[PDB]
């Protein structure tokens, strides 16, 4: 008569895209629409029991989260888990829920290893995955002739969820799985100056198509050092893997978009350097339903959660929890319509997988593996104004690259430079 | 009035050095001696509750084990946890017990990160640690003039507990922490022939003091390929990191000790090749108490556990659980003698730490970090007979290298070859 939904996310820390201050009201909106839909679980009263994935310091934990999962499992016996979004939180919890035969929904946990559904059984991801980033990079390399060598630089703060490592891991594995080109990689520490000589050296020795996963400032500093060292768009191209677009403002206002602008009297040199820089991000959903969702999300989050949801790409995560939860309810409704129960995790999960759905994020497709296809945007600066804008869009389901607003990919030489230099790298 | 000891180990798989078929009777021997000792917990009746660390396939698990820990914790509220021994089992469980403020004892979990007691609080290791291997290698390099460069080759079976990775991790980190010499490393797959050209190439390009963590057969094959390629003891020295001495028989009988003998008509070539090979292992405890312990262990294990405990270096692990359990009981006895309780994990742990103890394994020392100092032996072949024997012994506590039975380290050139070649590696 009622459905018990267990939640393991950061209930206090509001810094994560998947924080409860931001996923809570999104999920609240979803349950609210379930009530209004006579075609989604009629009569059922879906309840939620919460558990915090953060430890005593307030960051998501590889210990707090599994402990909270056990706690909710024996206290309430839920039919489905929601979250976590951190990789080190989700991995033990995922293995627990897979052992318990309980479905798991999260719009986080984008790491490669979560994709092993033979281990993470009944785990359905409705947000981005890092292999999908590899898919975008594969398509990019196929459409520009780069079929030899690329260099990947990535950095992480010590003690975090290692986001840039998992990003690069997914890109590395997938791209090498599909193209078998040499992908060189190098980790660095952002605050350590000893690595910048090393990195610049590696840049001009290991690749010409270069991907950097780092902070905005690290990528700016690297660009500034690359220009200072005579590395221009005629030979090098630097892709910043800024999937949440931290280096950009929101797509609602703040016209125009200048990631090289900092106000430190270096902005003139940074613009000239960023001529060789392009930014890869997730795609902002275009559909109006998304905009209406943000309006309601902001309203509810300020209302029953005392939080201010700001505009930005991070909001696709709570939108995907919302869409993911609705995708689940219909699956449960369809299972009940054929004599199943809410505990047939396999039947429910298979109903969600290999399926196209319409939610606030627009068209979303769950692949045969239980992971949402992820769309990406490619930003590029206009050589006239210097501001960055989307010039290329990647549909994750069709794997097609489509030009945006009749824009062209800016190249100082007219065409992309080769991924291998003239007479070798020497 | 009674002490509840929770145990999380492989209760069915008898393949691990820390299997219950091997640690069970060792621990039962320990409790049996606690009774006979009026100076250890008088009147208390120590009980044991068991949980298996292995999953449905029967290998130690990163899921079964933490689940079994929670299960025992809420069902019995123990005062101490025993095990697990696998690294991936012990890491989540250690973090659980650390959060619960419950002491943890294991003679396994040798991995580097378990040593971060700021995280794995109240975890006391009474068996070997892989940093302690770094300590032995450090003392070796200081005593033979190798202060520049060494190469480390390691391999693992896909899906295991990555033993050779954690061995190398501990060696790598500790040796670099103390000598700051270049330690190159390379992972390979044993079953993959494509790596043997690569490895031999790396051997003659990356180092001359070479450590290999692998199976006996992989190390034999590499030696045979190294001889076939003209790599002799005059320039190269190959250390096999065989801490449990799998490539050797037991120290009780089976005289003599020939790891190059295989019966495949390659034995004549393997002996000539193994002249450049030395084997690093844990040290067999000399004290008579150890031999009496093995006698009783074999008798009990065959009696109440239907298992046949065979002679070999692996038996130090259940001996160390036995000694660690006695170490704990005295700590608890001392805590109770000063008005504490059995739940003062901090007081009990600090009593065990930075302490010398006398057990079946002889003198054992818990360092300031809560990890047992580990003694190592260096095996070398006699150029007359070809059989291998201990020629060098490392006391982990005093960090001293002592010659064994007036033997000398065999060198084809009379002295060890330099860790750097003549006019560089080119």
């Amino acid at each position: 008569s009622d459905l018990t939904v267990a939640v393991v996310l950061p209930l206090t820390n509001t810094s994560y895209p998947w924080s409860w201050a931001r996923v809570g009201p999104a999920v609240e909106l979803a349950l609210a629409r379930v009530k209004a839909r006579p075609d989604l679980l009629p009569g059922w009263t879906v309840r939620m029991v919460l558990g915090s994935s953060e430890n005593a310091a307030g960051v998501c934990s590889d210990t707090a989260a599994p402990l909270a999962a056990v706690d909710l499992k024996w206290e309430h016996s839920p039919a489905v888990f929601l979250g976590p979004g951190c990789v080190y939180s989700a991995a033990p919890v995922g293995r627990f829920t897979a052992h318990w035969r309980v479905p798991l929904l999260t719009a986080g946990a984008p790491a490669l290893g979560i994709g092993v559904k033979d281990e993470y059984a009944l785990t359905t991801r409705t947000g981005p995955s890092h292999v999908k980033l590899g898919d975008f990079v594969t398509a990019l390399h196929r459409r520009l002739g780069w079929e030899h060598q690329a260099l990947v630089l990535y950095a992480d703060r010590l003690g975090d969820d290692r986001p840039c490592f998992f990003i690069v891991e997914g890109l590395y594995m997938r791209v090498r799985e599909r193209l078998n080109i040499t992908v060189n990689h190098q980790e660095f520490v952002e605050g350590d100056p000893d690595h910048y000589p090393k990195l610049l050296r590696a840049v001009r020795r290991k690749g010409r198509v270069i991907y950097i996963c780092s902070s905005p400032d690290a990528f700016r500093n690297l660009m500034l050092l690359a220009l200072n060292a005579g590395l221009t768009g005629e030979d090098y191209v630097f892709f910043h893997l800024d999937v949440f677009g931290q280096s950009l403002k929101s797509a609602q206002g703040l016209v125009p978009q200048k990631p090289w602008e900092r106000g430190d009297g270096q902005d003139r040199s940074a613009r000239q350097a960023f001529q060789a820089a392009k930014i890869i991000t997730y795609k902002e959903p275009d559909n109006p339903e998304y905009l209406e969702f943000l309006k309601q999300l902001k309203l509810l989050a300020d209302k029953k959660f005392n939080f201010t949801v700001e505009d930005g790409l991070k909001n696709i995560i709570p939108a995907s929890f919302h869409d993911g939860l609705l995708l689940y309810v219909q699956a449960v409704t369809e299972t009940l319509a054929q004599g199943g129960t809410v505990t047939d995790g396999e039947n429910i999960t298979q109903r969600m997988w290999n399926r196209s759905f319409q939610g606030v994020t627009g068209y979303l497709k769950i692949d045969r593996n239980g992971d949402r296809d992820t769309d990406f945007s490619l930003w590029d600066m206009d050589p006239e104004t210097g501001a960055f804008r989307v010039v290329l869009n990647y549909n994750g389901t069709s794997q097609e690259l489509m030009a945006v607003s009749e824009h062209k990919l800016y190249w100082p030489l007219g065409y992309p430079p080769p991924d291998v230099p003239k007479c070798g790298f020497d | 009035s009674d002490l509840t000891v929770a145990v999380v180990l492989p209760l069915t798989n008898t393949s691990y050095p820390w299997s219950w078929a091997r640690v069970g009777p060792a621990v039962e021997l320990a409790l049996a001696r606690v009774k006979a000792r009026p100076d250890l917990l008088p009147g208390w009746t120590v009980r044991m509750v068991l949980g298996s660390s292995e999953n449905a396939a029967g290998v130690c698990s990163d899921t079964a084990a933490p689940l079994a820990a929670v299960d025992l914790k809420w069902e019995h509220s123990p005062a101490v946890f025993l095990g697990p021994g696998c690294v991936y089992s012990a890491a989540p469980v250690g973090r659980f017990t650390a959060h619960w403020r419950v002491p943890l004892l294991t003679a396994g979990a040798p991995a580097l990160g378990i040593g971060v007691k700021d995280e794995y609080a109240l975890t006391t290791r009474t068996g070997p640690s892989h940093v302690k291997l770094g300590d032995f290698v450090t003392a070796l390099h200081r005593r033979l003039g190798w202060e520049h460069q060494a190469l480390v080759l390691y391999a693992d079976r896909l899906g295991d507990d990555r033993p050779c990775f954690f061995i190398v991790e501990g060696l790598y980190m500790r040796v670099r922490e103390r000598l700051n010499i270049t330690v190159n490393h390379q992972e390979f797959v044993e079953g993959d022939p494509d790596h043997y050209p690569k490895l031999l190439r790396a051997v003659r390009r990356k180092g001359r003091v070479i450590y290999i963590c692998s199976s006996p057969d992989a190390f034999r094959n590499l030696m045979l390929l190294a001889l076939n390629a003209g790599l002799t003891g005059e320039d190269y020295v190959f250390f096999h990191l065989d801490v449990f001495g799998q490539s050797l028989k037991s120290a009780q009988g089976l005289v003599p000790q020939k790891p190059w003998e295989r019966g495949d008509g390659q034995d004549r070539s393997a002996r000539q090749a193994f002249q450049a090979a030395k084997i690093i292992t844990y040290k067999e405890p000399d004290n008579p108490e150890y031999l009496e312990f093995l006698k009783q262990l074999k008798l009990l294990a065959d009696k109440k556990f239907n298992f046949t405990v065979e002679d070999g270096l692996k038996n130090i692990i259940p001996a160390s659980f036995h000694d660690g359990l006695l170490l704990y009981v005295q700590a608890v006895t001392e805590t109770l003698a000063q008005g504490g309780t059995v739940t003062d994990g901090e007081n009990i742990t600090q009593r065990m730490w930075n302490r010398s103890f006398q057990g079946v394994t002889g003198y054992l020392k818990i360092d300031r970090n809560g990890d047992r100092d580990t003694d190592f032996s260096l095996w070398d072949m006699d150029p007359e007979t070809g059989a291998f024997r201990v020629v060098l012994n490392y006391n982990g506590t005093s960090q001293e290298l002592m010659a064994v039975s007036e033997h000398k380290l065999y060198w084809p050139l009379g002295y060890p070859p330099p860790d750097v070649p003549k006019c560089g590696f080119d």
């Binding site: 790491a111 590395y172 594995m173 980790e187 520490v189 | 991936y88 890491a91 990775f165």
Partner: peptide, 23 residues
């Protein structure tokens, strides 16, 4: 891989050792 694909526990990320890192 030598560096990527090896489980998701912080115990296997204490040194890298398969990876190309400056730290």
């Amino acid at each position: 891989s030598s560096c990527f694909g090896g489980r998701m526990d912080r115990i296997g990320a204490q040194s890298g050792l398969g990876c190309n890192s400056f730290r």
